[PDB]
Chain length 627, copies 3
Amino acid sequence: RLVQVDCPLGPDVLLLQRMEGREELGRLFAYELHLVSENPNLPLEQLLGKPMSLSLELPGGSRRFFHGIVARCSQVAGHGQFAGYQATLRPWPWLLTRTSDCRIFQNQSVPEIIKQVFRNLGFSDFEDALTRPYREWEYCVQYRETSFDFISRLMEQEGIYYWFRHEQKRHILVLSDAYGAHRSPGGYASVPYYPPTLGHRERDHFFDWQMAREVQPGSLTLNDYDFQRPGARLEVRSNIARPHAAADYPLYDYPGEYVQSQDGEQYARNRIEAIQAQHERVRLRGVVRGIGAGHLFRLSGYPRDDQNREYLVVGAEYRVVQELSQFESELDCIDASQSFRLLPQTPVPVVRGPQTAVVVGPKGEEIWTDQYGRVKVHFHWDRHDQSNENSSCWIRVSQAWAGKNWGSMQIPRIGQEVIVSFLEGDPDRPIITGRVYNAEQTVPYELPANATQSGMKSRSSKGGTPANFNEIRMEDKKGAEQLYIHAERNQDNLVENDASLSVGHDRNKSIGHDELARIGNNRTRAVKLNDTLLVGGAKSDSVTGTYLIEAGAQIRLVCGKSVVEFNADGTINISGSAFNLYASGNGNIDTGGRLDLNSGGASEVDAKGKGVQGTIDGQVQAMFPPP
Amino acid sequence: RLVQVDCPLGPDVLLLQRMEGREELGRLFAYELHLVSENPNLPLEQLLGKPMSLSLELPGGSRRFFHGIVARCSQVAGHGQFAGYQATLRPWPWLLTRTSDCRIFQNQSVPEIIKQVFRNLGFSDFEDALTRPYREWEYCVQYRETSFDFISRLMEQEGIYYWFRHEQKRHILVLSDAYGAHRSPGGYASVPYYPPTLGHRERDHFFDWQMAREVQPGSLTLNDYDFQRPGARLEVRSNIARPHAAADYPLYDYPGEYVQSQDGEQYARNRIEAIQAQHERVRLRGVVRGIGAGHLFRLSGYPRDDQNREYLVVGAEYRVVQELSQFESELDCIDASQSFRLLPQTPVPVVRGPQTAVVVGPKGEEIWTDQYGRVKVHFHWDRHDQSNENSSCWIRVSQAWAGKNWGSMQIPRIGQEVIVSFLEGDPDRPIITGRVYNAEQTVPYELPANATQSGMKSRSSKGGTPANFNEIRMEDKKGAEQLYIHAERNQDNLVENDASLSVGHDRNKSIGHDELARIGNNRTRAVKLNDTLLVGGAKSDSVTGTYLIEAGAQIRLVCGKSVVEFNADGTINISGSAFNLYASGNGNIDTGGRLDLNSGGASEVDAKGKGVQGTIDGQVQAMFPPP
Amino acid sequence: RLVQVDCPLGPDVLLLQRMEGREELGRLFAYELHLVSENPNLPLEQLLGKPMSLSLELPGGSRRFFHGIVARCSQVAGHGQFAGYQATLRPWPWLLTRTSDCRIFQNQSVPEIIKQVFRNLGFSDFEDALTRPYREWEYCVQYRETSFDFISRLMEQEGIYYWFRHEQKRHILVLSDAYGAHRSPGGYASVPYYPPTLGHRERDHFFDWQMAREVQPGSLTLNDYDFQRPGARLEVRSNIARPHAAADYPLYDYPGEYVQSQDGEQYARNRIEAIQAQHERVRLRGVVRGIGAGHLFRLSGYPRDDQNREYLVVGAEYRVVQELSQFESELDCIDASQSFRLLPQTPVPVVRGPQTAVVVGPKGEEIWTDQYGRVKVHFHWDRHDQSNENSSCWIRVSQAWAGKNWGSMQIPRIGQEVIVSFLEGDPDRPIITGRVYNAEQTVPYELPANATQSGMKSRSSKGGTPANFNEIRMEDKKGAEQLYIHAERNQDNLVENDASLSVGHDRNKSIGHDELARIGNNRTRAVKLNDTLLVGGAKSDSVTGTYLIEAGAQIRLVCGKSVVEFNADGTINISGSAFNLYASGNGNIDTGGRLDLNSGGASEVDAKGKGVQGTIDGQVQAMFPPP
């Protein structure tokens, strides 16, 4: 008979003067309510945000309900006979546009993610009628977007759409990815067409009709890149053919958000089907009260036999007026044999540039990586994690030089700050592109005092202190240049062929304990001037062959009171306290001049203070002073 | 009586056939004029771009002026007696959309910056009626945007809004941030409401009314990151409560562009109040003449008690029709107790990627940094500076590896070219992410000739030349590999524990001056074959203990004419010019065979060319040839 | 008389009930057809996507053709005798919106590029009427955009625009850049104006007329940066003056995408002329059937003398009404003396973040660069190249540190993966900003096992194996620290002034072949304890001066059976098998006590196992074990 209102503040209190609105798959509905009352001050705030329910009486005594909430309301001028109120009726997912956040999801399918969101925000009136399996997303990020947009975006991408089901007292969001999740309203399995020139038919029926066709792209090719399998062919392609001319235009995109060719196939398919869903659209007008968006119906009685087929309502317009009554609707539908998909109309969030982040990992670790050198980080905007190994997925890190098991590598450690870039601005594809210092992670050299210094200084792990490091430092200060190398422990310089060391001026070497040198073949040393050797212990030279000691002026052998002097002019002096010259065989003592014995011609040789144990020791000790 | 005109080319020349237009807080007004005149060729260009005043005669003999600039004009069809002319009036800030530029502002508050813009372009008709304190911006950039847009988004961000004051001969932009900067028109302190059912009512009044309410977000949380205080909690939150349900939806954003929590608080508050300003708005229609955007008035006589309150005119529409006189206005108002703020409508400029820049500093410096290793640069687009130390703010510089007071460091120098990235595309957040070479800053090695070389080569400063550098160079050329290390001055290799040097083939060492080595404990050297030593000066060995010299075949002591030969078979030859064997005590000479004196059995020993000073000298000089 | 239709299915089948059309320079034409037919179900797919043309009865029996392609079609309600059908006609370039791709163009002018696109997609119905010379683009990229958008964008940038020429059987795309490429329709060289107050003139004529003038910017300054000439002044400026007030507002942009100042001039000029093309627009209404977009005509008979001038039809609107014949045309025109240019309305594609790519070059190379260190890469999305040296243009590569002929040097090699950034997101300005390891390009050390290792490992080229590399490795493992250096061939350490080596504990040195050392001046060595020397060959000392050998306790000379012992207490023992003491001159043998001969006082001195050839040999070879 009419439309009855069932709402807060009383049902009969508000009479529906008229209603106008729209339904559509994958979208939020909207209805304009023009309501009138007797109460001139009917509290708008007691309706705003509240559940509403329209009761349309249908044939057979059944009823169609329109449940939702008052997104917007208004009080308007009216008449002494009535108070005027208006309301914008919207579905509860609309409230997800009133809230926003940033958030990382890990190891979840999109269906699960959506459910997660609804649960997080206290919603329960929804139902999963999905039939297709979905890939598990390792890393998916909500970023600078509303919760609604996030959801919508995911659904358009994954090829999931939704429609609503109404119960007098609640509003249900049904998820679907198949025609099988759709239903025909009771008594509206098929709706007849009655050529409007015949006059208005009392039975619910159609009277207007239009079919539109448009040239769409015939093929979509996607691509991506998996660094774990670099040479793999990830190119995928989906094709849909149409009978008309010029139906073979290709599309190509990159990246397609997949690592498996199977996933790529699905995504390509979803997108090209969404496009192809626009190839043919059918518009009908009638007074049909039971059919809305998401419903299935079969057209009958239309002259052109071809059009008497089952359709899926993808959208609808409504117009209701009441007097104190008419009901008009317009349907927008497609051939039910077509695979309905949503068009990518929801904006995609883009990271507009680099962000800083902190490297994180397990509480007992210092360094945390894997076989690819990837690391995990904590983004400053992530207010929901615990700054640990569950913060984010593994992230590849740019190095100074990469190559086939060679190049440079300087793995970042926990607590260090890094610059994160995103491939094509996509929040789901982070990569490390630089290391930075901050007030905690300070620079290795005091600045600007040491601004002329550069280099690399490492740090022992685990438990290293400021004194535990290896470094290579370069000092460019004019007139005080330095190349400094420090090894915390051992140092090993291996040269496979020839090595060379050249020092323009002074070279010092100091070794705390033992030195061992071994020369493969020959060794030649030359000193242009003096060569001093001080030995605090004992010295032992052992030559397998000939040991030639040649001097150009004088050879001296001194040992306490034993003194031997060999002069270049042939003078040989030998002094001691006693001597024992012995031959097991014959001995000759010949002179060219006179041989004298006990004559007084020979005497002690002045050792000049040499060969004195105490003095010698002092000289050695002077080379090794205490610290 | 009517609306009069005061403009270039006359006042009574053009007659206002009709006017329609709009006013709005924080926005530019627009008035559409339909003007007519007896002069069929009234030069459009002599009106275009010029000041123009309209004058609405008001009650009490006062006048409402509309002063603006003919942004656009047109010659249209008209009558015989009066030809048609059209004009669009816009406020002088509109002209700031006709100009664009890239600029950097430093150490200035937004109020100051905006005023600076107006001064730069010759504008003076504005007034500062701001009251709250504002943050001083260290660095703020105008980039690829119009001057208008620049100041527009600054005002949105800071919660600054404006309205205009009209004087017969000029147009004033008044800056505002509180209701205290707003005024009620003379005689329009309060405006009565009368029912539209009365048809015509002569006194200025309202007759239409509508109040709209909409569900808005309830809370806003902002965040940011200050590298100078990394662990600080910059998270801030602002909350505004409404009496209706579903008023508790949170928003979250990042970065909020602040470093103090106080500042963040105020930015959050501004944003959420802007949103809340849309929660409730009132639409009024009436014939008031003096009330426009930015004016205050109190509604009176409206049946519903709580509608009779003070209002702020947010926006307004006007309609004027004059027969050759009707007047109508519609107002968009809010409750004057609410804090009016502008919505973020103005597009924000985003740097779409990296840019190159040159490192700059003081004329007498080559390196210019601070305690965090930051540097200053000159952007290529900044054509309004002197490439000096004031060209930009300090910029964080990425490094190869950054840790806690350790890591790698290579500070940019003046004149070097770098790659600058912007955090989240924000022009106000530059960061250096790479160093590059150019035609002036040439590469270390000639390419592609030395493309197989890699490494690091420094440069002495200040005042260094190409010959003053330290380097570590690697040559990968197959079959000619090289590891080259060079120190401009001093080199210091320090190993805490064990060091090792292994050379597969030959090793050469050359030292220009002195060499000194000290072995803390023991030293052993082995040479598989020959060991030659040349000493240009004197050699001095001093062993505290035993000095054992072994030979496997022969020991020779040669010194000019003195020759001593010790053979492994026991033969001891001692030849000299003379000798002096002496004991201070007893001396024994014993033979197993005969002891023959002056027998002729002994003779000179062949020195074999050894022991000759000149020869020895020559050999040393051979080892040390001239340069 | 009427409009005839030349179409598929038969020209006598469709009846054009009415038509609405839109034409415009640089844009796609659109015509709305409303037509009917005796066939109640005339196959829409047999018209969709096909060629079709209208034929408007012109004076002299000539015809105006409207050739185009049915972009869209629809079947609607109609008459009973004639069913209703609708169709939208569009230009064949419209089909380029149905396809997309990514693609690199190199060394081609824009005219050439556009033609290449048409050829690639099988189109030939176009003409080149360009009069201006164009710049050859080194590198130009189609990216994530439709083919139409790509060429549209290029034309806006270059100041190229187009219009269509209709032939009975085809739709011609004419490229143009000067008024000389435009034409006046036969009999429509000049079109007369008659006042609308005359009701109607039978001859084709104009009757409505408007002129609009608007304030536009007066000057444009562009800028860019050429790294090959860093100090160049690429700043350019173009100025256009208008006679009205305030015609002097400057614009500034960066980058202008040019390297020559001459080219910059052209681009600046194009942009400002496009802006200035909107300064003055003229609106005309008439029944002129022969004039369309791109045509030239002179206005005649307009009362204002100044308007009787030549015009260029920038755009047009059409209305056709038939009956079972009305015609109306509205034109947008500009003064033909103005330089028409298109306004930047086509969305410019932008890279939203970094991408990865592979370094490529010639088949026989490992390294491929130039004098600036630039490289060639292969982008993953460029499915049309051959992964060789022609895959892209030269790209500058970021380095760790870049200075004036000094700094770091690490050149990417063929097959390595790098991170590519785009300056300002412009696809035509790539730059390498990182280097990344992948499943083929593996990390230098096994991870996470060696996560505590860092450093640089190089690789010999060409043809180097895993064992052919130079490296510097640092090990931070706590308690196992190591600094490892490895030279595959030669190593050369050159210190200009002083060098120092300090080792806290032991130092080992092993050299495979010969060692040679030369000390410029003095050398001092000290050993706190023992000093052992083992020589497998012969040892030879050549001291020019004094060779002083001191011992604090004992000197021993041992060789085979010859033994000499010098004790600190003055005891000198000399033992051999035989001896030959000889003086060329005099000899003295003196004692203080007794001088005994053959008394038995002296005896053989123990060698204590020293001086044995076999033993010595064993000791030497023990230091040099096999292999």
